[PDB]
Protein backbone atom coordinates (compact mmCIF):
# COMPACT_ATOMS: atom_id res chain seq x y z
CA UNK A 718 0.00 0.00 0.00
CA UNK A 719 1.29 3.50 -0.89
CA UNK A 720 0.24 7.16 -1.01
CA UNK A 721 1.42 9.97 -3.27
CA UNK A 722 0.99 13.47 -1.89
CA UNK A 723 1.92 16.66 -3.77
CA UNK A 724 4.62 14.77 -5.66
CA UNK A 725 6.00 12.31 -3.07
CA UNK A 726 5.32 8.61 -2.41
CA UNK A 727 5.02 6.96 0.98
CA UNK A 728 4.92 3.37 2.12
CA UNK A 729 2.13 2.55 4.56
CA UNK A 730 3.69 0.86 7.58
CA UNK A 731 0.48 0.50 9.62
CA UNK A 732 -2.74 2.28 10.52
CA UNK A 733 -2.55 4.08 13.83
CA UNK A 734 -6.10 5.35 14.06
CA UNK A 735 -9.65 5.66 12.74
CA UNK A 736 -12.73 7.87 13.05
CA UNK A 737 -15.59 8.85 10.77
CA UNK A 738 -14.09 9.18 7.29
CA UNK A 739 -10.51 9.57 8.57
CA UNK A 740 -7.52 7.29 9.01
CA UNK A 741 -3.99 7.94 10.28
CA UNK A 742 -1.06 5.87 9.02
CA UNK A 743 2.49 5.50 10.06
CA UNK A 744 4.35 5.73 6.75
CA UNK A 745 7.85 6.02 5.33
CA UNK A 746 9.00 8.43 2.69
CA UNK A 747 11.29 7.31 -0.10
CA UNK A 748 14.23 7.87 2.28
CA UNK A 749 13.01 5.48 5.02
CA UNK A 750 12.01 8.55 7.04
CA UNK A 751 8.98 8.03 9.16
CA UNK A 752 5.86 10.26 9.13
CA UNK A 753 2.16 10.21 9.88
CA UNK A 754 -0.50 10.68 7.20
CA UNK A 755 -4.12 11.59 7.96
CA UNK A 756 -6.58 10.63 5.23
CA UNK A 757 -10.10 12.07 5.02
CA UNK A 758 -12.50 10.54 2.51
CA UNK A 759 -14.57 13.58 1.54
CA UNK A 760 -16.90 11.64 -0.73
CA UNK A 761 -19.75 12.62 1.48
CA UNK A 762 -19.33 15.00 4.40
CA UNK A 763 -21.75 17.84 4.98
CA UNK A 764 -20.30 21.27 4.36
CA UNK A 765 -20.14 21.38 8.18
CA UNK A 766 -17.86 18.32 8.25
CA UNK A 767 -16.06 19.79 5.22
CA UNK A 768 -15.55 23.20 6.81
CA UNK A 769 -14.46 21.53 10.05
CA UNK A 770 -11.43 20.09 8.25
CA UNK A 771 -10.60 23.22 6.26
CA UNK A 772 -10.53 25.18 9.50
CA UNK A 773 -8.22 22.62 11.17
CA UNK A 774 -5.76 22.68 8.25
CA UNK A 775 -5.63 26.47 8.22
CA UNK A 776 -5.10 26.82 11.98
CA UNK A 777 -2.61 23.92 12.05
CA UNK A 778 -0.86 25.69 9.20
CA UNK A 779 -0.80 29.07 10.92
CA UNK A 780 -0.14 27.87 14.49
CA UNK A 781 2.95 25.82 13.87
CA UNK A 782 4.73 29.05 13.00
CA UNK A 783 4.30 30.02 16.69
CA UNK A 784 5.20 26.98 18.75
CA UNK A 785 6.91 23.62 18.34
CA UNK A 786 4.52 22.00 20.84
CA UNK A 787 1.99 21.81 17.98
CA UNK A 788 2.40 18.86 15.62
CA UNK A 789 4.26 19.72 12.42
CA UNK A 790 2.22 19.71 9.21
CA UNK A 791 4.78 19.23 6.45
CA UNK A 792 2.48 19.13 3.44
CA UNK A 793 -1.06 18.48 2.41
CA UNK A 794 -3.28 17.83 -0.57
CA UNK A 795 -6.98 18.73 -0.77
CA UNK A 796 -9.55 17.91 -3.43
CA UNK A 797 -13.27 17.38 -3.44
CA UNK A 798 -12.85 13.68 -2.70
CA UNK A 799 -9.97 13.39 -0.24
CA UNK A 800 -7.48 15.08 2.06
CA UNK A 801 -3.94 13.92 2.86
CA UNK A 802 -1.97 15.60 5.62
CA UNK A 803 1.67 14.68 6.01
CA UNK A 804 2.64 15.29 9.63
CA UNK A 805 5.42 14.55 12.06
CA UNK A 806 4.83 11.12 13.54
CA UNK A 807 4.55 10.66 17.27
CA UNK A 808 6.15 7.88 19.27
CA UNK A 809 2.76 7.42 20.93
CA UNK A 810 -0.07 9.41 22.44
CA UNK A 811 -0.20 10.40 26.10
CA UNK A 812 -3.32 8.35 26.67
CA UNK A 813 -1.86 5.01 25.58
CA UNK A 814 1.49 5.83 27.17
CA UNK A 815 -0.22 6.67 30.45
CA UNK A 816 -2.13 3.39 30.69
CA UNK A 817 1.05 1.36 30.18
CA UNK A 818 2.94 3.25 32.87
CA UNK A 819 3.11 3.40 36.58
CA UNK A 820 6.71 4.61 37.16
CA UNK A 821 6.08 8.27 36.48
CA UNK A 822 9.25 10.34 36.71
CA UNK A 823 8.40 13.59 38.58
CA UNK A 824 10.95 15.59 36.56
CA UNK A 825 9.22 14.23 33.47
CA UNK A 826 5.70 14.97 34.70
CA UNK A 827 6.79 18.56 35.33
CA UNK A 828 8.32 18.89 31.88
CA UNK A 829 5.28 17.37 30.11
CA UNK A 830 3.17 19.86 32.06
CA UNK A 831 4.98 22.87 30.70
CA UNK A 832 4.74 21.22 27.29
CA UNK A 833 0.94 21.10 27.46
CA UNK A 834 0.68 24.64 28.85
CA UNK A 835 2.72 26.12 26.02
CA UNK A 836 0.64 24.28 23.39
CA UNK A 837 -2.74 25.18 24.86
CA UNK A 838 -1.49 28.70 25.60
CA UNK A 839 -0.62 29.01 21.89
CA UNK A 840 -4.04 28.13 20.61
CA UNK A 841 -5.64 30.43 23.17
CA UNK A 842 -3.65 33.29 21.74
CA UNK A 843 -5.30 32.77 18.35
CA UNK A 844 -8.80 32.53 19.74
CA UNK A 845 -9.31 28.76 20.08
CA UNK A 846 -10.76 27.09 23.14
CA UNK A 847 -10.24 23.36 22.55
CA UNK A 848 -12.79 22.55 25.29
CA UNK A 849 -12.36 18.78 24.76
CA UNK A 850 -8.78 18.27 25.87
CA UNK A 851 -7.71 14.76 26.85
CA UNK A 852 -4.46 12.73 26.91
CA UNK A 853 -5.19 11.41 23.40
CA UNK A 854 -4.79 15.00 22.19
CA UNK A 855 -1.06 14.95 23.01
CA UNK A 856 1.77 13.14 21.25
CA UNK A 857 5.08 12.22 22.78
CA UNK A 858 7.76 13.02 20.20
CA UNK A 859 11.41 13.71 21.06
CA UNK A 860 10.69 13.27 24.76
CA UNK A 861 8.29 16.17 24.27
CA UNK A 862 4.55 16.67 24.35
CA UNK A 863 2.87 18.07 21.22
CA UNK A 864 -0.81 18.90 20.69
CA UNK A 865 -2.63 17.36 17.67
CA UNK A 866 -6.38 18.02 17.65
CA UNK A 867 -7.64 21.55 18.09
CA UNK A 868 -11.16 20.50 19.01
CA UNK A 869 -12.51 21.71 15.64
CA UNK A 870 -12.16 18.57 13.53
CA UNK A 871 -13.58 15.13 14.29
CA UNK A 872 -10.97 13.49 16.50
CA UNK A 873 -10.06 9.84 16.00
CA UNK A 874 -9.73 6.66 18.05
CA UNK A 875 -6.80 4.21 18.10
CA UNK A 876 -6.76 1.09 15.91
CA UNK A 877 -5.77 -2.44 17.02
CA UNK A 878 -15.44 5.02 22.82
CA UNK A 879 -13.58 7.78 24.79
CA UNK A 880 -14.35 9.37 28.19
CA UNK A 881 -16.06 12.14 30.07
CA UNK A 882 -13.60 12.21 32.94
CA UNK A 883 -12.10 15.46 31.64
CA UNK A 884 -15.34 17.37 31.15
CA UNK A 885 -15.28 20.88 32.68
CA UNK A 886 -18.23 21.70 34.95
CA UNK A 887 -19.42 24.73 33.00
CA UNK A 888 -19.51 22.47 29.94
CA UNK A 889 -22.31 20.47 31.57
CA UNK A 890 -24.16 23.41 33.19
CA UNK A 891 -24.22 24.97 29.67
CA UNK A 892 -26.93 22.76 28.17
CA UNK A 893 -30.05 24.50 29.52
CA UNK A 894 -17.40 28.23 28.33
CA UNK A 895 -14.02 30.02 28.15
CA UNK A 896 -10.24 29.38 28.03
CA UNK A 897 -10.85 28.43 31.65
CA UNK A 898 -12.45 25.19 30.48
CA UNK A 899 -9.18 23.87 29.05
CA UNK A 900 -7.54 24.65 32.36
CA UNK A 901 -9.94 22.18 33.96
CA UNK A 902 -9.19 19.40 31.46
CA UNK A 903 -5.44 19.99 31.79
CA UNK A 904 -5.89 19.71 35.54
CA UNK A 905 -7.50 16.27 35.10
CA UNK A 906 -4.54 15.19 33.00
CA UNK A 907 -2.08 16.37 35.65
CA UNK A 908 -4.14 14.92 38.51
CA UNK A 909 -4.12 11.66 36.59
CA UNK A 910 -0.39 12.08 36.04
CA UNK A 911 0.27 12.56 39.75
CA UNK A 912 -2.32 10.42 41.58
CA UNK A 913 -2.46 7.77 38.81
CA UNK A 914 -6.23 8.31 38.39
CA UNK A 915 -8.52 11.13 37.30
CA UNK A 916 -10.79 12.85 39.83
CA UNK A 917 -13.99 10.95 39.13
CA UNK A 918 -12.58 7.70 37.74
CA UNK A 919 -14.21 6.67 41.03
CA UNK A 920 -17.85 7.04 39.85
CA UNK A 921 -18.14 4.48 37.09
CA UNK A 922 -21.81 5.43 36.55
CA UNK A 923 -21.69 8.14 33.89
CA UNK A 924 -25.05 9.86 34.26
CA UNK A 925 -23.83 10.72 37.80
CA UNK A 926 -20.09 10.89 37.21
CA UNK A 927 -21.40 14.06 35.60
CA UNK A 928 -23.06 14.98 38.91
CA UNK A 929 -19.79 14.95 40.84
CA UNK A 930 -18.29 17.25 38.23
CA UNK A 931 -21.28 19.59 38.51
CA UNK A 932 -21.55 19.35 42.32
CA UNK A 933 -20.01 22.00 44.63
CA UNK A 934 -20.43 20.14 47.92
CA UNK A 935 -18.48 17.16 46.53
CA UNK A 936 -14.77 17.32 47.22
CA UNK A 937 -11.98 16.03 45.06
CA UNK A 938 -9.35 14.50 47.30
CA UNK A 939 -5.78 15.85 47.12
CA UNK A 940 -3.51 13.45 49.02
CA UNK A 941 -0.59 15.45 50.39
CA UNK A 942 2.61 14.78 48.50
CA UNK A 943 6.25 15.91 48.50
CA UNK A 944 5.76 18.37 45.63
CA UNK A 945 3.15 20.50 47.35
CA UNK A 946 3.46 23.06 44.56
CA UNK A 947 2.09 20.35 42.26
CA UNK A 948 -0.64 19.79 44.83
CA UNK A 949 -1.46 23.48 44.62
CA UNK A 950 -1.53 23.52 40.81
CA UNK A 951 -4.12 20.75 40.85
CA UNK A 952 -6.00 22.60 43.51
CA UNK A 953 -6.36 25.74 41.36
CA UNK A 954 -7.05 23.96 38.05
CA UNK A 955 -9.87 21.85 39.50
CA UNK A 956 -11.91 24.70 40.99
CA UNK A 957 -15.49 24.34 39.84
CA UNK A 958 -16.07 28.08 39.44
CA UNK A 959 -14.32 29.14 36.20
CA UNK A 960 -14.03 32.68 37.56
CA UNK A 961 -12.11 31.31 40.56
CA UNK A 962 -10.18 28.89 38.36
CA UNK A 963 -6.58 29.69 37.55
CA UNK A 964 -5.70 30.95 34.10
CA UNK A 965 -3.07 29.69 31.69
CA UNK A 966 -0.95 32.87 31.95
CA UNK A 967 -1.08 32.45 35.74
CA UNK A 968 -0.19 28.80 35.43
CA UNK A 969 2.93 29.77 33.55
CA UNK A 970 3.93 32.02 36.44
CA UNK A 971 3.31 29.37 39.15
CA UNK A 972 6.29 28.01 41.12
CA UNK A 973 5.65 24.41 40.00
CA UNK A 974 6.41 25.49 36.44
CA UNK A 975 9.14 27.98 37.31
CA UNK A 976 11.39 26.54 40.10
CA UNK A 977 14.06 23.82 39.67
Ligand SMILES: COc1cc(C(=O)N2CCOCC2)ccc1Nc1nc(NC2CCCCC2)c2c(C#N)c[nH]c2n1
Pocket residue numbers: 733734735741743753755788804805806807808809810813853856865873874875876877
Ligand atom coordinates in the same frame (compact mmCIF):
# COMPACT_ATOMS: atom_id res chain seq x y z
C1 LIG B 1 4.12 5.48 16.13
O1 LIG B 1 2.95 6.21 15.85
C2 LIG B 1 1.97 6.25 16.85
C3 LIG B 1 1.63 5.11 17.54
C4 LIG B 1 0.65 5.20 18.51
C5 LIG B 1 0.34 3.92 19.28
O2 LIG B 1 1.13 3.52 20.07
N1 LIG B 1 -0.87 3.20 19.07
C6 LIG B 1 -1.22 1.99 19.75
C7 LIG B 1 -2.58 2.12 20.42
O3 LIG B 1 -3.55 2.53 19.47
C8 LIG B 1 -3.21 3.72 18.79
C9 LIG B 1 -1.85 3.63 18.13
C10 LIG B 1 -0.02 6.40 18.79
C11 LIG B 1 0.32 7.54 18.08
C12 LIG B 1 1.31 7.45 17.12
N2 LIG B 1 1.77 8.60 16.35
C13 LIG B 1 0.88 9.58 15.79
N3 LIG B 1 -0.41 9.43 15.92
C14 LIG B 1 -1.21 10.31 15.37
N4 LIG B 1 -2.64 10.12 15.53
C15 LIG B 1 -3.11 9.13 16.48
C16 LIG B 1 -3.01 9.71 17.87
C17 LIG B 1 -3.86 8.98 18.92
C18 LIG B 1 -5.18 8.32 18.49
C19 LIG B 1 -5.24 7.83 17.05
C20 LIG B 1 -4.53 8.77 16.09
C21 LIG B 1 -0.67 11.41 14.65
C22 LIG B 1 -1.21 12.52 13.98
C23 LIG B 1 -2.70 12.77 13.86
N5 LIG B 1 -3.83 12.92 13.78
C24 LIG B 1 -0.16 13.28 13.50
N6 LIG B 1 0.99 12.68 13.83
C25 LIG B 1 0.69 11.53 14.54
N7 LIG B 1 1.45 10.57 15.15
